[PDB]
Swiss-Prot record:
Gene: NDT80
Effect of residue 164 to A: No effect on DNA-binding but strongly reduces progress through meiosis and sporulation
Protein role: Transcription factor required for successful completion of meiosis and spore formation. Gets activated after completion of meiotic recombination at the end of prophase I. Recognizes and binds to the middle sporulation element (MSE) 5'-C[AG]CAAA[AT]-3' in the promoter region of stage-specific genes that are required for progression through meiosis and sporulation. Competes for binding to MSE with the transcriptional repressor SUM1, which represses middle sporulation-specific genes during mitosis and early sporulation.
Complex formation: Binds to DNA as a monomer.
Cellular localization per UniProt: Nucleus
Protein name: Meiosis-specific transcription factor NDT80
DNA-binding feature ranges: 1-290
Annotated disulfide bonds: none
Posttranslational mods: Phosphorylated by pachytene checkpoint kinase IME2, but also phosphorylated in an IME2-independent manner. Phosphorylation probably eliminates SUM1-mediated repression and is also required for full transcriptional activation activity. Phosphorylation of the DNA-binding domain by IME2 does not alter DNA binding affinity.
DNA sequence: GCGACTCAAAAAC
DNA sequence: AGTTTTTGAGTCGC
């Protein structure tokens, strides 16, 4: 009924089929590591502006809620929340140096203003994009929004237990304890250590995330989860690392910039999950029907 | 099939 | 040791 896997930090992932077993909404059993991500491709090279050294980049993503490994498939539920977190790392550059440096895209050099992540859902069989929606903790009693592009600086990915622990923190003392895990506050650095052209000072806001944390995410309520043949559709979640540059032949998305003008989120690397099954609202997807 | 209202159970404090 | 919050999901009815 429950299949258990040991996570890297010593917590467990407990996979169960909601068609057979109903578990409370806030049970720790709802938290579990989801499907592993795989490289799709590398896109635009990034180089340090004076040394010319190529910056080696790696997305480090994980799903921490919403997906179960059931009979060799990864399964989610349309009605339910998932959590997808990601960082990135630069294997050849330590953070403190990275933030003081400046970087260009090698396309012909566009200056990188900042690095950012976005997520997307797709139909894995035909590459059609599928809308995602996020809620606040208030759910129907608060706003809905589409996942946003997240400016980020390189950081190790927090352990699964840490994501769990930080999922619903209000208390100020506890928020203080997790703050340095999730944020860099640029307004707290020594400005005299930085040049005007430094990467840190082209980030759009003083509060900069160290971790892209997409919580309370769902597939859009209108998604069709079965093919016409009644076979399940296969979906995939994608994490894309990009460099945001000033618009003034390679993959990019437009972005509403800080100063108001157009911006380009230029793709650097993309990873995706294996195929995912999503179970819809049918009574037969729930143990209650039995 | 889907928005809405609702119940309920464990986390958060 | 209580109350409030958060979130899986039961149900109504179009």
């Amino acid at each position: 009924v429950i299949l258990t896997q040991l996570n890297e930090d010593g917590t467990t992932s407990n996979y169960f089929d909601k068609r057979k077993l109903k578990i409370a909404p806030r049970s720790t059993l709802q938290f579990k590591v989801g499907p592993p991500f795989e490289l799709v491709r590398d896109y635009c090279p990034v180089v340090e502006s004076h040394t010319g050294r190529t910056l080696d980049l790696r997305i480090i993503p994980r799903i921490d809620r919403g997906f179960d490994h059931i009979d060799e498939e990864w399964v989610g539920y349309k009605r339910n929340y998932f959590t997808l977190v990601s960082t990135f790392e630069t294997a050849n550059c330590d953070l403190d140096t990275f933030l003081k440096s400046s970087f260009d895209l090698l396309v012909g050099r566009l200056r990188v203003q900042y690095f950012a992540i976005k997520i997307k859902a797709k139909n894995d069989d035909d590459d059609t994009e599928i809308n995602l929606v996020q809620h606040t903790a208030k759910r129907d009693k608060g706003p809905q929004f589409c996942p946003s592009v997240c400016p980020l600086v390189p950081s190790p990915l927090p352990k699964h237990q840490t994501i769990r622990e930080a999922s619903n923190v209000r208390n100020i003392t506890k928020m203080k304890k997790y703050d340095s895990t999730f944020y860099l506050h640029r307004d707290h650095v020594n400005y005299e250590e930085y040049g005007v052209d430094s990467l840190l000072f082209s980030y759009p806001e003083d509060s900069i995330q160290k971790v892209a944390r997409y919580e309370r995410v769902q597939f859009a309520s209108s998604i069709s989860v079965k093919k016409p043949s009644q076979q399940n559709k296969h979906f995939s979640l994608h994490v894309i690392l990009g460099a945001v540059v000033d618009p003034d032949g390679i993959p990019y998305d437009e972005l509403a910039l800080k100063n108001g003008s157009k911006g380009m989120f230029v793709y650097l690397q993309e990873m995706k999950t294996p195929p995912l099954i999503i179970r819809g609202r049918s009574p037969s997807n729930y143990a209650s029907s039995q």
